Every structure is written in structure tokens, then in C-alpha cells.
Amino acid sequence: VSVLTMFRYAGWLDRLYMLVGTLAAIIHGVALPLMMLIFGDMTDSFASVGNVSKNSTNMSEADKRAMFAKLEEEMTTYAYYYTGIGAGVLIVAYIQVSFWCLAAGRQIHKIRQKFFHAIMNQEIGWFDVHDVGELNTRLTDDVSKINEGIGDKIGMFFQAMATFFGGFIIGFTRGWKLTLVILAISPVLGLSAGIWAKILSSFTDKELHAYAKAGAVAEEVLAAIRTVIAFGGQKKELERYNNNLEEAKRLGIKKAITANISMGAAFLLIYASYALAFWYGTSLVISKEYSIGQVLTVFFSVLIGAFSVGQASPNIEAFANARGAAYEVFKIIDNKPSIDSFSKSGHKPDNIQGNLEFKNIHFSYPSRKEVQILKGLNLKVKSGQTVALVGNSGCGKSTTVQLMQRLYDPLDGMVSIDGQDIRTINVRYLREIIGVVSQEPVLFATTIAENIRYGREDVTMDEIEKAVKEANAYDFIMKLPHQFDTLVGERGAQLSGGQKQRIAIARALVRNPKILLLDEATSALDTESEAVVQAALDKAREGRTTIVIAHRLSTVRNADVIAGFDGGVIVEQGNHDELMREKGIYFKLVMTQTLDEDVPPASFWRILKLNSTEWPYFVVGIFCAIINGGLQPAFSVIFSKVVGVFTNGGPPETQRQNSNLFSLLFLILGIISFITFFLQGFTFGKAGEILTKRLRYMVFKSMLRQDVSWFDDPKNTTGALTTRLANDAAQVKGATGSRLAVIFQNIANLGTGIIISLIYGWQLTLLLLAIVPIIAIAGVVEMKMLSGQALKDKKELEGSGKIATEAIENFRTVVSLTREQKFETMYAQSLQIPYRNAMKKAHVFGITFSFTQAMMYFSYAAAFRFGAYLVTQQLMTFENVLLVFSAIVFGAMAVGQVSSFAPDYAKATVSASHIIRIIEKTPEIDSYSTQGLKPNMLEGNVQFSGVVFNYPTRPSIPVLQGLSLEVKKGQTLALVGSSGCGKSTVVQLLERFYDPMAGSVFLDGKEIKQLNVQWLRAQLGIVSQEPILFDCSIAENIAYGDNSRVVSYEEIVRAAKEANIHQFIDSLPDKYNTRVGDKGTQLSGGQKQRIAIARALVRQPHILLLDEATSALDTESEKVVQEALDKAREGRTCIVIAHRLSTIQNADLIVVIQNGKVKEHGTHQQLLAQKGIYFSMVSVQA
Ligand SMILES: [Hg+2]
Ligand SMILES: [Hg+2]
Ligand SMILES: [Hg+2]
């Protein structure tokens, strides 16, 4: 049910095609082991012919007859075998995949649409809670996981039955208690394998989790770097914790590693154990009873069974996951909560006109406990009027303006439109009949026209034309390029909020209501526009009855009535002069107011070269690698031997021959490998450890040392970098361990196979190598195309989903709801196309998969057939075919390798290239001399000449175009610019973060072009807007490890002293010892700046960069700090730059720079004397 069933609902000819495909799956699995059996009977006839071949030494002609007999005979049998099966799979494989999509396909389509409309209907809850972000995200993420859940489930079914029926059909049928010898030994061994192996496997995971914890404590902060570049470079705290925990769980999860290893050793040691009881119990039960050399088929086949239970397991996992996902957040999906609103049938007050009536309504936000903002409120408002709501402490005004749209049903009491109660009339209708314009005016990415059209679907540009013009929009929309068809460069990002807002008004204007709510509308907008905007509002509302809430008491006046609010609290109602005449709230408040990137450079064999660089040595590992390899073909022969030396030979000793080869198979594989792993995993794994550590280090310092427009002008977020660090070291480790499983698999498969290929008598050797390359080639080609379709669909769906987020992500739609389905509808179209395309690709997956299995039979058949070729009287055609199985199984061996161990190279090589380009870099500023700190360079006179520059992005021309100023010593360079850039760039430039594109500078005596950077920054009393401190105790922060500068206590005290942060230092728990506590949050920026300043005056500079420092503070913070910055200066030169146009008066040389070019300068009154620019600045300052 629900879980599983709801999970699998929706589907007539769906459910039917489904059960059909399941069936195909069934028969298919059954194919694999039937195929086993037949391999058996062909093999038996093969023994009989080899047995009499063994006898030989007699009637030659009867050998030519007995032989061409079974030859051509089983030759017929082989034919009908590849046939029956072969054709079989092709047909049914294609069928089970047609299961996959036909099913999941339609099933999701249905899902998809229900959810789209579902979300769009959850209404005010979809704001009430839900990250919304986390939502759309889940829309796609989950929807898809459902998909995988369905077609893979099919895969399982199929295998569930090749295992079930195999282990059965043969696991019993053949042997009658011998097949049980199977059941017995076999399933039992298989038991020890499953347990022990899986035991450690869980053990492994636990190892990996503890790893993860250590890796986070391997992270810490890595941002704020600007502050940290003027700091120097942590460099050692990072390494410290890094290699600490890493090494730890390195070798540790590396024991579980060398335990995954020790695990390969498990399953495999225990694999050859299989071989043990396998052959053992076999041989005994082959010299006594059931003497066939065909126990093979049986036991061997039951083995196939185990393997299949494996594949079945991952498929099942898939199912369950997709279930959990959909099903649970499906009740989140399907489910039709709503009721807090709806958008269907209802009541219709077509009387048009009427008065609003807020009657005795209490209400608290959706968040169950906040105060009932509307704490019992009554109000009424006549028609054609326009009422002003006046509040400030938030939480009310806006809200009544809220439910006046039924946004939320009234907690208690009620409201009435016209004369009926809001709740009673239908929504779509209400919402329409209620024009509304709030602050944030949002415009979807489209033409102006289309946005107004959103206001009203059907409607002709003649009406829009009217609309705009009515909302004074007609002018700009006309001069602006393209006209109404002009767009809106992705989101409402292209024009001024002023016009945005206007456009809106137009939108709502075509909606043409009878109620109009203006939520501060005009607000948060430039003054002049505010005018124009309110202007359009005016020409809009009187026709309509309107409730407006706002702060511009200036635009309040003309209120037919006002009401007193201020954070949920109704009081004084009435006309202006009345609420002023009251000298109450109105009057009161009235007077109070007066992460993408991927790069082309690869690294052909380079990270190999550099590999070994990132390497000490471990030939040892590669050593056993070679052995592991041989180990495999070895098996090929040891087995081929058994069967051989028992399918044709001398009677006595066959027990010892058996028994021997049996144990041989065990001791050999079992041990050798257990070993192989243990060892190799030890050495090579350790290579992964180190490589990754000495790597995270290498890279990190590369960054610390790096700098300049890296973060100075990036698109390499803190994340992108923490990312790089962790993920990349890992990956690379991968590129090296890979070179290892390379020499290895290599020798094994080929080398060994080829030698034994010599003993191959050129008729199979060749017979196969042709086959393996082709079937191998399939593995590849198939997976390839499978990816193409996967990604491309991700694209089409991306168009759709991208736009479905546009909506859900923009709820400021339900506002009008005049799009709803219309919306998700446009997306119904998009889908539509990717849907038809989906049915096809369904088919595709099928044909492909199938064709692969057809290769299955083709391969085998041709093989065994050709091999057998010519056994007329006993010729070069006999047992050797078993070594043929050896080279076929060889190709399959290497297959294990590609589909196992480290990341398919790839992502690892990519990651390598990446972390390599990053580790290469250009220090740009480590050491250097460019002076020798001469014991006189203390003057501190700053020189800026020519100074032309633009932070790399130069196309936006520079913000410094031919600049030149300077600053005497022990004094104060006053900086007053336009805004933002300019003041910053200057500072920086001194800090020589970015070097001027032309011209030069002299902190005193010579090219702050070429002066030793580290020293240049030795002196820099820098303190900016947003201070900051990494979490050391403030005593340490204070002690900002500028360099060798030791934590001079009394020094840190000197700072705290003139810092005036001492006020917190005197008492405040733990005093200096108090860590910034939680990275900061526990102290006002005022105190913070006190510390920053400390830091600085602790450095005992000579020059100072006071970048608008206090430009966000208040009273005694501001002031006291100016007292700090005060005594902080005059002892040294300092460019105090700011937007404190006021307190800037105490300046030595005040320069008025106009972004790029300096236009005014001199002393204050002298500047005013120069009535003009600086003047206007002071005249606006008022
Ligand atoms: Hg599919
Ligand atoms: Hg609130
Ligand atoms: Hg090895």
C-alpha cells in the first residue's frame, strides 16, 4: 500500500506492460543457469570422446566414427544451444528494458505534473515553512530517484530469479543430494563469505565515518583571507590538524582499508575455499558415485547463484531508496493539504463595489506561538476612500493588509468585503478584485508586455498601452530600447526599482480591482522617483477604495483617514489634524520623524611524472601486483588441469590428481591472494595516505602564497577551495594507485595469458582475442551512449525545472494567482517534448542492453564450437579448450579491474590536473629584499603618481585613471570620494595587493612598485568597515601574529589600552583569555573595532589606512573610537578616508577624488571656499 503501492500507482496499460516485462526478466535469469547445464552436457559427451581417445591403441576406424559422431552430433547440440538461449536473451532483454522506461516513464510524467501543481497549491504554508530552496531542489532530486527506483527494480527481479531458479533448477535437480553436496558445502562456504566479509565491510564504513570527522577538523576557516593576507599566512595550524587526523584514520581507515583489502582477501581466500570443498567433495563424489566430471555444471552453477544474490542486493537497495524518497515526501507530494485557501469553485460577489470591514479580529502568524499580532482589532473603511495605516515596530500593519487577501484566515473574529465576509467568497475572485502592490516589485524574465500580460492573460497591447501610460510607464518603456518587447535580463534585474515598481502598478492596473493595498510601495526607493511613483499611485487609487500602510508621513497627509499602529496596537483613528490635535501616536511618530569550473589542460602522463615526484618508492607493491596477476591466469590452468586430468587420463591416482589440484587451487589462490592484498594494500594504500597529506599541504601553502586577483578578484569561493583541498588530494591518490593496478592487471591477463597462448594451438587464441576486444568494446560503447542520453535529458528537463523554480521560488505570484496552472502549464508543454523523446530513449536502452547479451551467446557458442573443431580420430582438438576458458575468463578478469578499485582514473586525473595547476601558481610575494628596512625608512611619506588601474576585469576600464596625491609624515591624509570604489583601491594599492597598471608609489622613498612587500605591509595601520578576527582569544588576536612579533603581553596591553577595548579587558569574564568565542558573535562591532585598532597600534605602524572604519556604529563607540583613532594618529601618517563627511573636518589635506580623477583638495574652509563639488557634498550633508 501507500509506501509500495501508492509508490506504484497510476497505470492501466502501464501495470500490464509492467508485469509483462517482469516476466521477461524471469525467463532471462533462468537463461544464465540453463546455459550452465548445457555447458555440462556438451562437456560430458566431451569426456566420453576423450575417454575412448585415452583408450585408443585399438580400432582406429571406430575412433574416426565414434568421434565424428559426437563431434558433428554435439555440434548440432551447440547450434541449438546458442540458438535457443541467444535469440532468447536478445528478445527478452530488450523486453525487460522496455519495462524500465515505458513504466517509470509514464509513471513519473504523472508524478512530475501532480507535484508541480501540488507545490503550487500548498499555498501559504509554502512560505509558512519549507526552505523553498530546499524544495525545488527536492522536486528534481527526488522525482528522479523515484525513476531509478522503477527500472532498476526490474533489473533486480530478473537477477532475483536467475539466482533463485539457478541455485534451484540446478542446485537440486542435478545431483539428487549431490546437487546437495552442492547445496551443502557450497551454500555453507558461501555463508562464511557473506558474513565475515560483510562483517568487516560494516567495520570499514565505521572507519570511513570517523575519517570524515577528522577531515572537518582538517578544515577550519580559510576565508577572510583578505584580512589574512595583510596578516601573513597561518600555514602551520592548518597543516597541524590536517596531517594529524588524516594520518590517523589514514593508516587507520587504511587498516580497514587494508581490511577492504584484507576483505578482498576475505571473499577471495574464501573464494578458493569454495574451490576447496568445491573440487574436494566433487572429486570424492565423482570417483565413487555420479562419476561424470559433470558435477562441474552443478556446483559451478550454484556458484552463479551466489553472485546473482549479490547483484540482486544493490538493485533492491535502489528500489527501497527511491521508495523512501517519493513515498514519504510523496505524502509531501500527492497530498492536498490546502483548505487554508484553495483555488477552485466558490462564492461570487459580483455586486462589485463595497467597503472593507475588519471586525474584532485576533490573529497570530502561522508560527503557532508568536503574539497574536492582531490582538483583537476592529476597523471599517468606506468606499472610494483611501485609508492610511501608521505603524513602525512592525508586525501588524502589513499583516492586516495581508489577510485582506485571505493570505491567512483570521485567527478569530472576521472581515467583510462590500458587506459579505471575505472568507465566504471565492479566492481567485477575491485575489483578483484586490489590486496589490508591495515593496519588492518583482518582474519575471520577459518582455515588459508579457509582465503586464501576467497581470492579465488575455488583453491587447492597446490595453497595455493604455495601462502603462496610465501608470506613467509609457515614457521610459518608449525610450528604453526595443519597446514593450524589450526584455528583463534574467529576473527583475535590468532597470531601476522605480520603473520596476511602476511596471508593477501597470500590471496590477490591468487587474483593475476595487480594493488597492499599498504596502510601503513607493518606499525603499530614490526620493525623486518616490515622487513620480506616488504620483502614479495617486492617479490610480481614488477610483478605488484603498488601504495604504507607510512611513512617508508626507504622503500620509492626504489620507481620508489614518489609524494608529506600531507593532500590533490599534488606537487613534481619524483625520490628520485630528491625530495631531490628539497629540497622540500619529502626532508623536509624526514629530519623531520631524559552483562550476572544469578546465581543458589535462595532464598526459604528467601527474605520472609528477606522480612519482609525489612518491618515495614502493616497487614492492607493484611487485606483488605482478604476482596477483599471474595468480589469476594460474587459476585458469589449475582448474583446466583438474577437469582435464580427470576428464581424460589414468584411473588410479585420479584421487591424488584431484585432491592435489583441489588443494592446489585453494592454497594457491586462497593464500597467495590473501597475501597479495594484505601486502599491496599496505604499501600502496600508504602511498595514498602520504600523497594526500604532503599534498593537502603543498596545495594549501600554494594558496596562502598565491594571492593577488586570486581572491583579490575571484569566482573561486571559500567552498570551491575547501572543496579543492579535501576532494582533490583524495582523487590524486587515485591516479597513482591506478598506475599500480595497471602494471598488474596487465601482466596477469596478457603476459600470463599470452604465454599460455603459446601452448594455445592457434585456433581459439585467435578464436577469442577477437571476441574479447568486441565484447569489451561493447562494455564501453554501451555505457557511453547510456551517459549521453542521461545528460541530454538532464538538459531538456533543466529548461523545464529551471522555470518551475522561477515560479515556486517566486510565490509573489499567488498574489495574483493569474498564471497558476497557466504556469506549471507552460511547463506541461516543455515536459511534453522531453516526454515523447523519453519513450524513444526507452526503446534505445532496450536495443542496446539486449545486443550486449546477444553478444553473450554469440561469443560463447562460436567459441566452444570453433574450438571443438575437428575431433575425427583424435586430433589437436581436445582438453586445451579449458585454457581457452582461461583467456575468455582473462578478459573478464581485467573487467573486474576496470569496474573496480580506484576511481575510473578520469575524475581522479581531472582532479589531479586541477590540484596541480593550483599547486604550480606564482608566489607573487613570499620573500624579496626590495629594500632592507633601512633604519630611516620610518618617515612614512606616501607617494602616488600616475596611478592608473582596474582590478582584473579591466574591461570595465579602471577606477583609477591618472591619479596622483601624496601625504606628508606623522600626519593625516583626508579622503573624500564619490562612493564605494576608489577609496578602497587606493588603500589596497598601498597594501600593494594589486599593482597599478601605470605610474608608481613611494611609502617614503622608492617605488612601492618595488619595495619588499612583506615589509611594505610591515607598516599598515589598516582597519575597515567589517572588522573580524579568527577565533583565538582576543589576547592572541590583539597579538595578531603580524610576524615574529611575539605575544608581547604588556604590548597586547598597550593596544587594549589605546584600543580602549580594555573596558572589556578589565573585567569581562576570563578577560584577555576570552576567545572571540564562536568566531566572534558575542561583541558589538564597536568593541571589535577597538580590537582591530589594537592589532594595528600593536603593530606600531607609521602609516594608517582607516577605511571608513566606523561607518556602522553609534554614540560612545563612534566617539570614543574617534578618540582612539585620534591619539592613534598624529604620532603617525594616516589616510583616514571615509563617508563621515562630517567628522572629516579634522584633516590635514582633504582631497576630493572623483572616481579615477582628483578634482578638489586643500583645507576644509579652503575647500568650501572652492564652492562647488565638496561644497555640494557638505550642502547635501546638511
Ligand atoms: Hg530508462
Ligand atoms: Hg512578525
Ligand atoms: Hg599487489
Ligand SMILES: [Hg+2]
Ligand atoms: Hg572595487
Ligand SMILES: [Hg+2]
Ligand atoms: Hg585564530
Ligand SMILES: [Hg+2]
Ligand atoms: Hg587619520
